[PDB]
Every structure is written in structure tokens, then in C-alpha cells.
Amino acid sequence: GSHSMRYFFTSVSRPGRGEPRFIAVGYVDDTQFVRFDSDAASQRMEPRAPWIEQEGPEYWDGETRKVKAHSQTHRVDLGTLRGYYNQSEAGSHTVQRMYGCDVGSDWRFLRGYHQYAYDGKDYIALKEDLRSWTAADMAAQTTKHKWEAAHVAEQLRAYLEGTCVEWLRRYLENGKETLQRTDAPKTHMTHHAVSDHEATLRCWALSFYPAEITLTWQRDGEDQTQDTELVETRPAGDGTFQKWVAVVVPSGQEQRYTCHVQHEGLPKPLTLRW
């Protein structure tokens, strides 16, 4: 399977006083491994996974210098964008950036990406070929031209196909005990009478990793979506994820219904019957 390294950055302007609030988080697949918060006293990139603590003082120093420089970049951006969108100095605005790289099952570069948003809307993104840009509006055309002229795409491409993949591979190895371990969901069904004549069947998937999963109900071997409820996948807080899907059924007919669970942690899909 493929693996990903992604960094997420949020800067929020504080028009009343001071510099923007800046929060940066790094993930390998669905695991957070580093963070920086401008509001924290340490003013350092901090570890969030045990395997990144294998890296020495030189790592934390280098990552901190870069992440602080990135915060100043965003600070500049917030001022520039206020001007592009003719907004007043009194409202708070948001810049978000995500970038990262994937390696495939062959452990080689697969994909790179770099996306930017302003006030919750696409602004500019690097195209899949890592050579050109997609501007969502006329303001972003200005940025696209500036970045084309300064060959930003080439710089980012060299990073994405080089350093980014090299370090992802390094992290995967160092963290193999957890990053490359799949946790199959622990599944069970609960049953709740809502009356003397019908019942709710809830099919649970717990403690799974990674987050991707499919849960579906069938009745007599056909997909059933009517009269079901499916919650969004949610973090358990210990690095694993949870999901459930429920269906309401006539009392005594429970045996017709099957819960189907698909997850990379499973040799083949599971079929549950009450």
C-alpha cells in the first residue's frame, strides 16, 4: 500500500493586536508526529509520536527554524491577501496550507501536492505534474504569475520527489512497529428494542487503524441504505478510530440483515449476522 507524509498549517490574523495565531501539524498517514503552536511557550517544534524522538537535537533545531520561517511567510500572506480582496484591517482572516508526498508499494515517489486556501476557499494549488498551478480566482492569478516567474514549482518538485520521500521512508522504518502495523477493527453488534415490534441493530467497528473503512448493511444479501444511520469516522483518542452503522428492523427479522466490514487490516471483508 501507499504511505503519505503531510503537513497542515493554519494562520489566523488577530486584527485587535499582535501576530497571527499559527498552528502546524505533521502526519505520517493517519498518525500525527509533530506540532508547532505559536501560542505555546516552548517556541519549538514538538514530538507527538515516540518514533520521531529517535531524531537528535539537530532535527528539532532545523525543523523549528523552518516552521518559524513558515509562520512569518503566512503573516506576510495575510497582509497581502487583505489587500488583494480589499478587506479592512479590522476583521480576522484565515490562511491554510497543506503539502506532502506519497510513496507507493514500491517505496518510490508516487505523488506530490501543495494546496493553499484563503478564508476557507481554494486559492492556489500545485497541479499533479508538479510543474504548474491552478488559480481559483483572479487574485490567485497574481500569485500564480509571481510563483511561475520565481520557479517555485521547480523548487517544490525537487523537494517532493527528493527530501520529502527520503524522509517519509526514514520515518516509516523508524516507526515501523506502529506506522506499518494495521489494526483490524474489533467488531460487534448491539440490539435495542424501540418497541414491541421493531429493533435497532448497530454494527460497531472499534480500535482500527488506518481510518479508511467501509461499513454497510445488507438485507437478504442486497445493499440496504434506507432506514440506516452511519456516523462519520471519529478518533478514539489513543491513535485509533471508530465507526458505527445502524438499521431499524422488524422484531424477529434480525437474521435477514448482515453487516459488512471492509478494512486493510482484514485478510478479507467480514460479514456479521446477529
Binding site: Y7, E63, K66, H70, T73, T142, L156
Partner: peptide, 9 residues
């Protein structure tokens, strides 16, 4: 490992 991010919009 972060990329240096100097390019402003």
C-alpha cells in the same frame, strides 16, 4: 522534514 517555505503569495 519540512520544506523551506519562503515564497509569499
Amino acid at each position: 522534514n519540512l520544506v523551506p517555505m519562503c515564497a509569499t503569495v
